[PDB]
Design an enzyme around this catalytic site. Structure first.
Site, PDB file in Angstrom:
ATOM      1  N   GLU A   1      -0.561  28.279  -1.877  1.00  0.00           N
ATOM      2  CA  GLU A   1       0.114  29.406  -2.538  1.00  0.00           C
ATOM      3  C   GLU A   1       1.444  29.010  -3.200  1.00  0.00           C
ATOM      4  OE1 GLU A   1       0.267  32.700   0.276  1.00  0.00           O
ATOM      5  OE2 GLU A   1      -1.913  32.802   0.371  1.00  0.00           O
TER       6      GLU A   1
ATOM      7  N   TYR B   1     -10.854  43.175   5.997  1.00  0.00           N
ATOM      8  CA  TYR B   1     -11.065  42.701   7.361  1.00  0.00           C
ATOM      9  C   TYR B   1      -9.795  42.766   8.200  1.00  0.00           C
ATOM     10  CZ  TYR B   1      -9.509  38.490   4.898  1.00  0.00           C
ATOM     11  OH  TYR B   1      -8.835  37.593   4.083  1.00  0.00           O
TER      12      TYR B   1
ATOM     13  N   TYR C   1      -7.890  40.777  11.387  1.00  0.00           N
ATOM     14  CA  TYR C   1      -7.764  39.624  12.294  1.00  0.00           C
ATOM     15  C   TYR C   1      -7.521  40.086  13.738  1.00  0.00           C
ATOM     16  CZ  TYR C   1      -7.181  36.207   8.382  1.00  0.00           C
ATOM     17  OH  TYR C   1      -7.401  35.364   7.286  1.00  0.00           O
TER      18      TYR C   1
ATOM     19  N   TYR D   1      -6.340  42.529   6.060  1.00  0.00           N
ATOM     20  CA  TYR D   1      -6.265  41.786   4.808  1.00  0.00           C
ATOM     21  C   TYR D   1      -7.370  42.250   3.880  1.00  0.00           C
ATOM     22  CZ  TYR D   1      -2.829  38.037   5.646  1.00  0.00           C
ATOM     23  OH  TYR D   1      -1.676  37.291   5.764  1.00  0.00           O
TER      24      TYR D   1
END
Ligand SMILES: [Ba+2]
Lengths: 175, 175
Positions: B70, B17, B19, B25
């Protein structure tokens, strides 16, 4: 029971909800980029904030996503599904908030220097991450830019007073 | 294309996709509690990650929310609307990532310990918060627990190769 379809429907709505962990939150969509909130239960019960800068979008008809970051460094992603009287929220707490929640129990707007000095000095990692569904127990139309909605510290009976209609007048201002 | 209705429809789906800010990403629903990702564009372009523990729920029919934190400290809240080929993501980057995304530009799994030291050593605040809609340009039925999907570093033409059918064989294994 009102149907939410557009962002305009959503903006100016005032909510009380309870996460599956039993934590009761209060939240107000003040305008398209601003939120007020007040915490009644859980780890940071007592905390309240006005004029919090936020991203507010409608994901799809009737579903709204709000994203912000707090003075303590806490990150929040909320997904409102008001047509189903439910929310999903993910709260990312810095380590230091989990260890010393008492520090953050205040009207944060009046103590920004304390929050920021605390977030620099103390531990950030590992985060405490709380991803939970919630039940919405109150929805009221405050209108937008209503400065009275969240304008005092929580007290134990407050949500009940709000839900019983003992808290706001005909102008949606404090009795 | 397919209708997504349940969590099982969603699990095992491989996405690419873009953004609204132009960042491309790649994302994969490996199982009910694990994601793989690969970054093609923007700030941390070149980063890739396997076996990232995440919270995955279906919010309501065909709408899915993925929350994780993360090794670098970055907090992520993704919302998938695969029936509308839309996504909304909010990524809360620690300041040092926006400062030096290059450290992070690596196969993160071989660098967990470096990321942990880096996040403690360097500035967390102010955070860069990136809340954006994204158009889904690819969806593939990878199946769950498929370790071929994300198993090498990105290269320029990769998302094109994936979209044009030149990357996987019929079993969804690397060509
Ligand atoms: Ba309204």
């Amino acid at each position: 029971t009102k149907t939410f379809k557009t962002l305009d429907d959503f903006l100016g709505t005032h909510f009380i909800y309870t996460y599956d962990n039993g934590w009761e939150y209060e939240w107000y969509a003040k305008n398209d980029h601003t939120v007020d909130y007040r915490i009644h239960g859980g780890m940071v019960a007592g905390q309240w904030v006005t004029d919090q800068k936020a991203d507010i979008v409608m994901l799809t008809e009737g579903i709204y996503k709000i994203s912000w970051t707090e003075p303590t460094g806490t990150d929040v992603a909320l997904d409102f599904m008001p047509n189903e009287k439910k929310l999903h929220g993910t709260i990312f707490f810095p380590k230091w908030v989990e260890e010393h929640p008492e520090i953050t129990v205040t009207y944060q707007n009046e103590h920004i220097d304390l929050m920021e000095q605390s977030r620099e000095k103390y531990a950030t990692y590992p985060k405490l991450v709380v991803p939970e569904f919630a039940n919405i127990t109150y929805m009221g139309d405050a209108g937008q830019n209503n400065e009275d909605v969240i304008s005092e510290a929580p007290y134990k009976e407050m949500p009940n007073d709000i839900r019983n209609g003992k808290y706001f007048d005909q102008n949606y201002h404090r009795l």
